[PDB]
């Protein structure tokens, strides 16, 4: 039975998570941008990086943005679609929330969102969050609307990896 730190060490060794510049501290209580999380998903699920394609209109989303290949992969894969379809905003600097992460992993794992789910999640996410809870990706007392901590993301990613095996 591994601690959150040991799960992190393992995922980092596997190249799925990385740390912070200048320090080996894993900063498990810190948050994560949607950009960095896209990359996590790409490494976690072995997705192919997509260069030279730009499907969003966010400021500074272009060839100079290191995250675009990962964001494009998770979008082609159907894991993430962004926050606004008519304006094509992904919001890559905003932080990944528990309910957002829940959707991505539930989808990757082909678990079915719970229609009729009763919980504190935003409307669009209720079923994804319930499915993620039921599958043990996040604790039931996690706050679906909060920014996910890196600890929570390490636990969720580690559990998801084990379910793909
Ligand atoms: C605010 O709208 C939500 O935005 C969420 C952003 O996070 C993810 C995981 C994403 O697809 O990128 O999920 C999004 C939700 O589907 C939802 N987006 C829309 C367009 O309805």
Residue numbers in the entry: 28 to 192
How is this structure described in the published paper?
Prokaryotic cell envelopes often include proteinaceous surface (S-) layers composed of self-assembling subunits in porous two-dimensional crystalline lattices. S-layer anchoring is best characterized for Gram-positive bacteria, where S-layer proteins non-covalently attach to the PG layer via species- and strain-specific non-classical secondary cell wall polymers (SCWPs). SpaA possesses three consecutive SLH domains near its N-terminus, followed by a large C-terminal region presumed to harbor the self-assembling domain(s). The crystal structures and binding analyses presented here of P. alvei SpaASLH, SpaASLH/G109A, and SpaASLH/G46A/G109A with synthetic SCWP fragments provide novel insights into the functional contributions of many conserved SLH domain residues, including SLH-Trp13, SLH-Gly29, and SLH-Arg43, which precisely interlock from three different SLH domains to generate two active binding sites.
We investigated the effect of this flexibility on potential ligand binding in G1 by solving additional co-crystal structures in different space groups (P1 and C2), where further unique conformations of residues 44–54 were observed. To further investigate the activity of these two potential binding sites, we performed isothermal titration calorimetry (ITC) analysis of SpaASLH binding to 4,6-Pyr-β-d-ManNAcOMe in solution, which revealed 1:1 binding with an apparent dissociation constant (KD) of 29 nM. This 1:1 binding in solution likely occurs in G2, because this site is occupied in all five crystallographically unique molecules and has better complementarity with ligand than does G1, which was only occupied in one of five molecules. The pyruvate moiety of the ligand is bound deep in the pocket through salt bridge interactions to Arg61 and Lys130 and hydrogen bonds to Gln108 and Gly109 backbone amides, while the hydrophobic face of the ManNAc ring stacks against Trp151. Upon binding in G2 of wt SpaASLH, the phi angle of Gly109 (SLH-Gly29) and the psi angle of Gln108 (SLH-28) each flip by ~180°. The backbone carbonyl of Gln108, which hydrogen bonds to Arg61 (the conserved SLH-Arg43) when unliganded, is resultantly replaced in space by the Gly109 backbone amide nitrogen, which forms a hydrogen bond to a pyruvyl carboxyl of ligand. Concurrently, the removal of the hydrogen bond between Gln108 and Arg61 allows Arg61 to make a bidentate interaction with a pyruvyl carboxyl and O6 of ligand.
